Amino acid sequence: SDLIPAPPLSKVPLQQNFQDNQFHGKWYVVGFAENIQQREDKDPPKMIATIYELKEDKSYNVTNVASNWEKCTYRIKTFVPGSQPGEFTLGEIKSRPGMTSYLVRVVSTNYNQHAMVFFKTVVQNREKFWITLYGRTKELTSELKENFIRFSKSLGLPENHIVFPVPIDQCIDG
């Protein structure tokens, strides 16, 4: 297909009154939707956790924790506060091959249960974007999942670009 373009940022809400010290800690990636088509017959992915550690310099250390064969992998990046609370840039942008832009926008959260976060990068001179549905728990309600589907579709993503990863016991509980 044609690339699904990133929506104008006007179409991506910013969570009002974002509180960095309440968004801290571990989130499970309960849902994921990206502008590349799932893959078609693919193995359902195992759930990852993402830990947001608020540092004293006001950035987050962001650690993705995942299972692979009899091992756990941790990958760290830095989110640096952007122009408005709840927006971030990538601290490592200047070392990422082919990357010219990276934006994080926290769309919605209640801090103690769920969040939705929008990501947009320009890599190899093309737009990539994705939305994550975070839970403080590995499972969320049908209402929250449905709201995530609706929001994903509102940004142009077809249903078959939306993935609900499978909870696992390894790695992601620390």
From Swiss-Prot:
Record has Signal as a keyword: yes
Protein name: Neutrophil gelatinase-associated lipocalin
GO CC annotations, alphabetized: extracellular exosome; extracellular region; extracellular space; specific granule lumen
The protein's assembly and partners: Monomer. Homodimer; disulfide-linked. Heterodimer; disulfide-linked with MMP9.
Main location: secreted
Entry superkingdom: Eukaryota
Function of the molecule: Iron-trafficking protein involved in multiple processes such as apoptosis, innate immunity and renal development. Binds iron through association with 2,3-dihydroxybenzoic acid (2,3-DHBA), a siderophore that shares structural similarities with bacterial enterobactin, and delivers or removes iron from the cell, depending on the context. Iron-bound form (holo-24p3) is internalized following binding to the SLC22A17 (24p3R) receptor, leading to release of iron and subsequent increase of intracellular iron concentration.
Lineage, highest ranks first: Eukaryota, Metazoa, Chordata, Craniata, Vertebrata
CDD domains: lipocalin_2-like
Organism: Homo sapiens
Keywords: Apoptosis, Cytoplasmic vesicle, Disulfide bond, Glycoprotein, Immunity, Innate immunity, Ion transport, Iron, Iron transport, Pyrrolidone carboxylic acid, Secreted, Signal, Transport
GO process terms (BP): acute-phase response; cellular response to amyloid-beta; cellular response to hydrogen peroxide; cellular response to hypoxia; cellular response to increased oxygen levels; cellular response to interleukin-1; cellular response to interleukin-6; cellular response to lipopolysaccharide
Induction, as annotated: Expression is activated by the oncoprotein BCR-ABL; BCR-ABL misregulates expression via the JAK/STAT pathway and binding of STAT5A to the promoter. Induced by insulin.
